């Protein structure tokens, strides 16, 4: 199928309490597979999915040295950015980084990503051409000119077209059914009287992967959009996801209501009832 790999870095300054904390996580699609934390006792890249565990010592050692160097680089970036914005040297600030690749079923690169936020606001981003930058403001233009002089876009493009695509291909090969084959939801409807005249119907989707899902209540096969309570999709903690949708109905009218479930793992969309 189509697949993505993403790395997410967070650096948070803490002036007076030492160097910024740097955290990295890596994902294939909706599966976290690595972490690094600069505050760990002996910081190293650690596995977080079973199929990455087979990578040899050279992998872990290379990646650990990268994160240690990136933490120092982000520390310099946070110092430069509080200067660009004329900000107090006492305050805590956040630098976030997000990069990686989207590939099609043949493993070919569809899109590369390399972008940054400062204190939760977009700062600079590599354009879809993988050759030019979009800067948010005059501070980010300082970074843009520095990165143009250093030929940073060519370095990012080499990774995104090269190591990103090749390593994602590898992970999909080693992760087999865990990454390639969607896990459909386990579904059920519950019923909760509110009063003699009103009841809640709640449609559950549990244990599904990936996270993308649609749950809708219908009355006689028509969507009840404006009357459905829908919770945000949430992690079960075992790499699968949960969601529910609820509707309040007149007591004795439950039979008019059906829950429609759309998920990649389902052979076809499900229609569920209170039963």
């Amino acid at each position: 199928g189509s697949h993505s790999m993403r790395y997410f870095y967070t650096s948070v300054s803490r002036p007076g309490r030492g160097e910024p904390r740097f955290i990295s996580v890596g994902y294939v699609d909706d599966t976290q597979f690595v972490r690094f934390d600069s505050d760990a006792a002996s910081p190293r890249e650690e596995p977080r999915a079973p199929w990455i565990e087979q990578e040899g010592p050279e992998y872990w050692d290379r990646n650990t040295q990268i994160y240690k160097a990136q933490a120092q680089t982000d520390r310099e970036s946070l110092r430069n950015l509080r200067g660009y914005y004329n900000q107090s040297e006492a305050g805590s600030h956040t630098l976030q980084s997000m990069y990686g690749c989207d590939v099609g079923p043949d493993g070919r690169l569809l899109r590369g990503h390399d972008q940054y936020a400062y204190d939760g606001k977009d700062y600079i981003a590599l354009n879809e051409d993988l050759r030019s930058w979009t800067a948010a403001d005059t501070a980010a233009q300082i970074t843009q000119r520095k990165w143009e002089a250093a030929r940073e876009a060519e370095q990012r493009r080499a990774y995104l077209e090269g190591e990103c695509v090749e390593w994602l291909r590898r992970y999909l090969e080693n992760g087999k059914d865990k990454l390639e084959r969607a896990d459909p939801p386990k579904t059920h409807v519950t019923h909760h009287p509110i009063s003699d005249h009103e009841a809640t119907l709640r449609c559950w989707a549990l244990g599904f992967y990936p996270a993308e899902i649609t749950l809708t209540w219908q009355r006689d096969g028509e969507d009840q959009t404006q009357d459905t309570e829908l919770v945000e999709t949430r992690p079960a903690g075992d790499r699968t996801f949960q969601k529910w949708a609820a509707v309040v109905v007149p007591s004795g009218e439950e039979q008019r209501y059906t829950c429609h479930v759309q998920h990649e793992g389902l052979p076809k969309p499900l229609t569920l009832r209170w039963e």
Partner: peptide, 9 residues
């Protein structure tokens, strides 16, 4: 695998 370290901003 992650990308080699960037130039500072």
């Amino acid at each position: 695998e992650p990308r080699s370290p960037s130039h500072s901003m």
